[PDB]
Design a protein around this nucleic acid. Sequence first.
RNA 1: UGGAGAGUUUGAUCCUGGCUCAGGGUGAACGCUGGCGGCGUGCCUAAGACAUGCAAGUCGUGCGGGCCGCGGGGUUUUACUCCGUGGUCAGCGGCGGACGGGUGAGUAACGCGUGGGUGACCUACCCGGAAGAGGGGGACAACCCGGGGAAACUCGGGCUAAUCCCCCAUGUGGACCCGCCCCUUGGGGUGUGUCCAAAGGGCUUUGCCCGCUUCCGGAUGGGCCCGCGUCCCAUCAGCUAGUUGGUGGGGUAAUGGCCCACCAAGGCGACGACGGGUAGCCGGUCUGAGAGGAUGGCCGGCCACAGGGGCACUGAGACACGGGCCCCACUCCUACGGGAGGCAGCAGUUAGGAAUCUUCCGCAAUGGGCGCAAGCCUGACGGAGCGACGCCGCUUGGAGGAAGAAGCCCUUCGGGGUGUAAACUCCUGAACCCGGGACGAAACCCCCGACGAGGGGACUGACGGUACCGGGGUAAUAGCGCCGGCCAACUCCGUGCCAGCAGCCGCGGUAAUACGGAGGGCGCGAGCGUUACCCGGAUUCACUGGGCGUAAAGGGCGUGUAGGCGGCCUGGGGCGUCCCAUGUGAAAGACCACGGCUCAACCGUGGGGGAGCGUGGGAUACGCUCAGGCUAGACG
Lengths: 208, 83, 99, 99
Amino acid sequence: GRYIGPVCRLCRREGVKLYLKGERCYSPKCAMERRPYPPGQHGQKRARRPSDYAVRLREKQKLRRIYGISERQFRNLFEEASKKKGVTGSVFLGLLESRLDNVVYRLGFAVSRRQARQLVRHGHITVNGRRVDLPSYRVRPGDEIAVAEKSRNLELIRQNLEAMKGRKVGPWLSLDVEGMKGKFLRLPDREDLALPVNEQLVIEFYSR
Amino acid sequence: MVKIRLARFGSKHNPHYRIVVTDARRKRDGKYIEKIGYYDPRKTTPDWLKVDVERARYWLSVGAQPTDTARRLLRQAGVFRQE
Amino acid sequence: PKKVLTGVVVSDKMQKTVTVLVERQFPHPLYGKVIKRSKKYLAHDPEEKYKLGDVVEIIESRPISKRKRFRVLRLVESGRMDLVEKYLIRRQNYESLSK
Amino acid sequence: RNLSALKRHRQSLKRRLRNKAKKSAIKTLSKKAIQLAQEGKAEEALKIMRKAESLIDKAAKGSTLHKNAAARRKSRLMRKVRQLLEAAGAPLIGGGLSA
RNA sequence: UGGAGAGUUUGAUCCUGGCUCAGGGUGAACGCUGGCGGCGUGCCUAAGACAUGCAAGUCGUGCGGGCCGCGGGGUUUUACUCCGUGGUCAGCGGCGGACGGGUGAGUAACGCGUGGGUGACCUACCCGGAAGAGGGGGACAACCCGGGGAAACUCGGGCUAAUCCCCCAUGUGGACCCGCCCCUUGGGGUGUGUCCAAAGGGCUUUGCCCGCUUCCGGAUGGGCCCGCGUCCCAUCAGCUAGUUGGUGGGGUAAUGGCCCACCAAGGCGACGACGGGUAGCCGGUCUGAGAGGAUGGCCGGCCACAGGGGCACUGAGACACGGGCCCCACUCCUACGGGAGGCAGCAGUUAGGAAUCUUCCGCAAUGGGCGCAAGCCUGACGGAGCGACGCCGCUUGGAGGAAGAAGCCCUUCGGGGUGUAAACUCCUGAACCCGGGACGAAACCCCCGACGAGGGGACUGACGGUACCGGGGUAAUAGCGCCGGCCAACUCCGUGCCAGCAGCCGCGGUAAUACGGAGGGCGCGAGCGUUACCCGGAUUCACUGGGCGUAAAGGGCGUGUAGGCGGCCUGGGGCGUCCCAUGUGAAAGACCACGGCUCAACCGUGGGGGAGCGUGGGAUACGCUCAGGCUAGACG
Ligand SMILES: [K+]
Ligand SMILES: [K+]
Ligand SMILES: [K+]
Ligand SMILES: [K+]
Ligand SMILES: [K+]
Ligand SMILES: [K+]
Ligand SMILES: [K+]
Ligand SMILES: [K+]
Ligand SMILES: [K+]
Ligand SMILES: [K+]
Ligand SMILES: [K+]
Ligand SMILES: [K+]
Ligand SMILES: [Mg+2]
Ligand SMILES: [Mg+2]
Ligand SMILES: [Mg+2]
Ligand SMILES: [Mg+2]
Ligand SMILES: [Mg+2]
Ligand SMILES: [Mg+2]
Ligand SMILES: [Mg+2]
Ligand SMILES: [Mg+2]
Ligand SMILES: [Mg+2]
Ligand SMILES: [Mg+2]
Ligand SMILES: [Mg+2]
Ligand SMILES: [Mg+2]
Ligand SMILES: [Mg+2]
Ligand SMILES: [Mg+2]
Ligand SMILES: [Mg+2]
Ligand SMILES: [Mg+2]
Ligand SMILES: [Mg+2]
Ligand SMILES: [Mg+2]
Ligand SMILES: [Mg+2]
Ligand SMILES: [Mg+2]
Ligand SMILES: [Mg+2]
Ligand SMILES: [Mg+2]
Ligand SMILES: [Mg+2]
Ligand SMILES: [Mg+2]
Ligand SMILES: [Mg+2]
Ligand SMILES: [Mg+2]
Ligand SMILES: [Mg+2]
Ligand SMILES: [Mg+2]
Ligand SMILES: [Mg+2]
Ligand SMILES: [Mg+2]
Ligand SMILES: [Mg+2]
Ligand SMILES: [Mg+2]
Ligand SMILES: [Mg+2]
Ligand SMILES: [Mg+2]
Ligand SMILES: [Mg+2]
Ligand SMILES: [Mg+2]
Ligand SMILES: [Mg+2]
Ligand SMILES: [Mg+2]
Ligand SMILES: [Mg+2]
Ligand SMILES: [Mg+2]
Ligand SMILES: [Mg+2]
Ligand SMILES: [Mg+2]
Ligand SMILES: [Mg+2]
Ligand SMILES: [Mg+2]
Ligand SMILES: [Mg+2]
Ligand SMILES: [Mg+2]
Ligand SMILES: [Mg+2]
Ligand SMILES: [Mg+2]
Ligand SMILES: [Mg+2]
Ligand SMILES: [Mg+2]
Ligand SMILES: [Mg+2]
Ligand SMILES: [Mg+2]
Ligand SMILES: [Mg+2]
Ligand SMILES: [Mg+2]
Ligand SMILES: [Mg+2]
Ligand SMILES: [Mg+2]
Ligand SMILES: [Mg+2]
Ligand SMILES: [Mg+2]
Ligand SMILES: [Mg+2]
Ligand SMILES: [Mg+2]
Ligand SMILES: [Mg+2]
Ligand SMILES: [Mg+2]
Ligand SMILES: [Mg+2]
Ligand SMILES: [Mg+2]
Ligand SMILES: [Mg+2]
Ligand SMILES: [Mg+2]
Ligand SMILES: [Mg+2]
Ligand SMILES: [Mg+2]
Ligand SMILES: [Mg+2]
Ligand SMILES: [Mg+2]
Ligand SMILES: [Mg+2]
Ligand SMILES: [Mg+2]
Ligand SMILES: [Mg+2]
Ligand SMILES: [Mg+2]
Ligand SMILES: [Mg+2]
Ligand SMILES: [Mg+2]
Ligand SMILES: [Mg+2]
Ligand SMILES: [Mg+2]
Ligand SMILES: [Mg+2]
Ligand SMILES: [Mg+2]
Ligand SMILES: [Mg+2]
Ligand SMILES: [Mg+2]
Ligand SMILES: [Mg+2]
Ligand SMILES: [Mg+2]
Ligand SMILES: [Mg+2]
Ligand SMILES: [Mg+2]
Ligand SMILES: [Mg+2]
Ligand SMILES: [Mg+2]
Ligand SMILES: [Mg+2]
Ligand SMILES: [Mg+2]
Ligand SMILES: [Mg+2]
Ligand SMILES: [Mg+2]
Ligand SMILES: [Mg+2]
Ligand SMILES: [Mg+2]
Ligand SMILES: [Mg+2]
Ligand SMILES: [Mg+2]
Ligand SMILES: [Mg+2]
Ligand SMILES: [Mg+2]
Ligand SMILES: [Mg+2]
Ligand SMILES: [Mg+2]
Ligand SMILES: [Mg+2]
Ligand SMILES: [Mg+2]
Ligand SMILES: [Mg+2]
Ligand SMILES: [Mg+2]
Ligand SMILES: [Mg+2]
Ligand SMILES: [Mg+2]
Ligand SMILES: [Mg+2]
Ligand SMILES: [Mg+2]
Ligand SMILES: [Mg+2]
Ligand SMILES: [Mg+2]
Ligand SMILES: [Mg+2]
Ligand SMILES: [Mg+2]
Ligand SMILES: [Mg+2]
Ligand SMILES: [Mg+2]
Ligand SMILES: [Zn+2]
């Protein structure tokens, strides 16, 4: 499914500016920079005080639509995190960040997460030399996420890695722009992520 | 008679065998007496064949009969080597 | 180990056989209360040595007959007719509840 | 329209007649000897008991009168014979029975 | 490393209380929709009825033949006959047909689970050890002849071989009676007496191989017995004649009242007998914070069954699914006399049903049977096919793109919404098109060595030109439910207690956010809903964890049986209780870690577990028991 369709309507409905197109969510064209109200005929009307279930559902939907992961994989990852020892929320965020498509996005190979998903699915991304075409692939600490030697001549990768010159990467990632590769150093901490999501709200949403 | 044979435990197109001591009259995946090794025919890992040599020698001393494949795998593990 | 029980001879009216009543205490599986159950075993007395009221040990044995699978190991203590009277009163109460 | 395992059936029939015969002899001889043990004719009694024991063991050679059931029949025969001669005495021929 | 509640009785409140919802689950079915792959899974009903094919055979290295054919001999020719050889056919004989496979009928039971007993037992093949195999004789098939029958098939006569059957001998040894010793249920030893053994075949031929016989042991498999546990109804309270026990027998591998004679009058039951109903049981599985509740499909273990009922034969082993006999129902053949048959084996047909698959491929892999071996058989199995039935992975594009096309819907007529959504611009390349193209497969076997160890060599792929790799390469399925509250999502029109909706509360009789349609929105997404069922919430059968003055609930009262419960002190026992050690707790599953399919599902390896029960030892505060003592309870 992948929800494929309009994206900045989620930028509007969630009330927080999301980055689903990469660019144009920074440019004054996101429609969140100019239309912050939710979509539909009844978007500009006075909003009623939402229920607690409303708040938790909206927060979980925000966190899910940020990564573009379906409800099935999302709930499975949450249950997997809850089975493990440690804080459920931080482990859940580390699991979501460990996805191959999200790592490709974080490493600057793609401008958006869905563009990264298409780059992975089409075999333009390799892991430790071997080609991997699975967005749900879990990257372990130490894996070298590289670009296919046959794909390093493509225009989009040239553009993205030409813009990545001088740009800093996450504290848990390393980037080699000349070799067009990177390394997943460690699992990111909660302080490492600046996501506008309260993970405890999602934990309480699935606690029901 | 009691025999030393292989039992199939992997999934479809993914065969994984247990070198096992069991009565011949039972099904090949049924209740065996003892697992004395394991064998991976596709060589997926560097350790794709392990045999408990002393236990195999015991079961051969008491009168177990291995299959041709089982005897081959045991011979590869030096069960019969008397050098 | 062959099971060894201890009970009371409550019937010597058979030939070379005695009815040994054996009690046992155990906690209830759900309610935890220590409850007391009992069972009568037909034990082999090849010498008619044991009489009514005798508290005797009983040993698991090769089957002597149908329902007779135990022998009398030894005599724990001599005739105490109090437990026999208790059993007989428990049996006599059955005639009072018919219709 | 059936398979030739019927052969097995045929064989069984033969073996049946092979077994029923031997047993029918043994029993017969047994009775005879016991009669002579009741009437006191110890010589002929033991002389026939020897042949009966021989037939018992020979039938035990095959599948007719196989494992220690044959020893059971021999035991009962020799016991009954020695007991019946003890009601008369004089084990003349001194055959199967030990001194 | 684990626990959420909400709606609803009232004008309003608190409580009690039921109903309902949010969650998870399924061998599912039904509606709408429906793209790919991997792994799983798929008659829950009629244990109804079945066409058809296959599913259990194999050994010429146990034995003699028939038929068809060839070659070489004794003969001058003929007749007759001898030897060798090929194919085929059954027969005699051995092993296997008791495994594997199917199913849940029946069973409330030593059936199963669990822990023990067997001094009361068996175990073909296999392994280790000791010893032996001498001589003679006989029969039935095949085959030949004749008869009966429509058939199935059957009867009589005659010839013959053997690893077929029998006799005598040898007695390593074993079996039995009796006696003695040890041991203690029928265990082990010893003496006399008696009884019991055998089979040959093949060669690389006088030396080995496959075997045979007796015995002891191992190993494996099993039989029987016992403690404890195992659903509902007491609107089932009394049950029992082989019934309970004894003696002696029969029977079995073995105990047993299993069976039979005779004798005794016992045995069972509110601690639920007997009866009725229901139901294979378990490892596990689903749910649950747990306790518990529910369940026993796939896989694994044990049981039982093979159209219904009964029964023996053969055998190490069967009361024998594809063996036999009889009775019953059914179907088919029938010359009406009589016969044949048994998918709950694989696939398939039909019936029933809401519903459950291919009359597929293969002997390559693993396993099984027979054989020295070659090899043969194997619908066990390994695969493929069909079905969103489940689980997992993936696609229907990515980026740029207006203060914002049209259409459509609202509207204070200013405008707002569908919405960067689209068209479009650039980019990648699902599908597909080619080429390469597997792992799974190295053993049996052969050669060297010594038919050993070791070394070497060769054959063999159903899946399948599939997986996978390389190149080329097209923007290229989205649906379903919901939007009054519980519960995330609102307007317009139509309708007018009509048509309808509805899990619960409830909505509609003129302007319905609840009906129907539209626009918009919310939720999931190759799925979405519905129905059914289970657990959950439900502390609503309350052990954890509830109650009974007025909400459902104290018996009308007493006397008292069983049962439950028991003041203070000392001691003995150690039953409950507790502790240590040890055995048991199969595997799979669950948990954790690492690893293999590009990830996952799936799978492999390792680790950790654990109640219960058995055994040995220990503790004695409490409960228990026994013995004694005290007076505060009780009675006098
Ligand atoms: K009575
Ligand atoms: K209220
Ligand atoms: K004949
Ligand atoms: K002797
Ligand atoms: K044994
Ligand atoms: K409990
Ligand atoms: K059979
Ligand atoms: K390309
Ligand atoms: K070799
Ligand atoms: K490519
Ligand atoms: K109308
Ligand atoms: K409506
Ligand atoms: Mg956690
Ligand atoms: Mg946790
Ligand atoms: Mg078996
Ligand atoms: Mg190795
Ligand atoms: Mg060796
Ligand atoms: Mg007692
Ligand atoms: Mg008496
Ligand atoms: Mg008796
Ligand atoms: Mg046959
Ligand atoms: Mg045969
Ligand atoms: Mg006669
Ligand atoms: Mg804790
Ligand atoms: Mg703790
Ligand atoms: Mg009222
Ligand atoms: Mg009201
Ligand atoms: Mg009022
Ligand atoms: Mg539900
Ligand atoms: Mg549900
Ligand atoms: Mg359709
Ligand atoms: Mg459909
Ligand atoms: Mg499939
Ligand atoms: Mg299938
Ligand atoms: Mg059925
Ligand atoms: Mg069911
Ligand atoms: Mg042979
Ligand atoms: Mg011939
Ligand atoms: Mg010729
Ligand atoms: Mg002539
Ligand atoms: Mg033949
Ligand atoms: Mg079976
Ligand atoms: Mg019943
Ligand atoms: Mg038991
Ligand atoms: Mg019972
Ligand atoms: Mg048991
Ligand atoms: Mg034999
Ligand atoms: Mg034998
Ligand atoms: Mg031997
Ligand atoms: Mg002859
Ligand atoms: Mg002759
Ligand atoms: Mg002869
Ligand atoms: Mg014949
Ligand atoms: Mg002739
Ligand atoms: Mg004749
Ligand atoms: Mg001797
Ligand atoms: Mg002799
Ligand atoms: Mg013979
Ligand atoms: Mg001979
Ligand atoms: Mg010779
Ligand atoms: Mg009774
Ligand atoms: Mg007896
Ligand atoms: Mg028998
Ligand atoms: Mg009886
Ligand atoms: Mg008796
Ligand atoms: Mg009781
Ligand atoms: Mg009953
Ligand atoms: Mg039933
Ligand atoms: Mg759980
Ligand atoms: Mg549980
Ligand atoms: Mg159950
Ligand atoms: Mg089953
Ligand atoms: Mg099963
Ligand atoms: Mg049937
Ligand atoms: Mg029948
Ligand atoms: Mg029957
Ligand atoms: Mg046999
Ligand atoms: Mg027999
Ligand atoms: Mg049977
Ligand atoms: Mg039968
Ligand atoms: Mg059949
Ligand atoms: Mg017949
Ligand atoms: Mg129909
Ligand atoms: Mg199928
Ligand atoms: Mg085929
Ligand atoms: Mg095969
Ligand atoms: Mg094979
Ligand atoms: Mg299969
Ligand atoms: Mg999916
Ligand atoms: Mg776009
Ligand atoms: Mg192109
Ligand atoms: Mg290979
Ligand atoms: Mg082969
Ligand atoms: Mg040689
Ligand atoms: Mg070799
Ligand atoms: Mg091929
Ligand atoms: Mg390609
Ligand atoms: Mg709401
Ligand atoms: Mg509706
Ligand atoms: Mg419902
Ligand atoms: Mg109107
Ligand atoms: Mg209206
Ligand atoms: Mg409406
Ligand atoms: Mg719409
Ligand atoms: Mg569904
Ligand atoms: Mg419920
Ligand atoms: Mg409850
Ligand atoms: Mg609760
Ligand atoms: Mg209720
Ligand atoms: Mg309570
Ligand atoms: Mg209450
Ligand atoms: Mg009162
Ligand atoms: Mg009392
Ligand atoms: Mg009392
Ligand atoms: Mg006290
Ligand atoms: Mg008391
Ligand atoms: Mg004391
Ligand atoms: Mg104790
Ligand atoms: Mg386990
Ligand atoms: Mg659980
Ligand atoms: Mg991996
Ligand atoms: Mg433990
Ligand atoms: Mg103890
Ligand atoms: Mg003490
Ligand atoms: Mg006192
Ligand atoms: Mg007074
Ligand atoms: Zn945006």
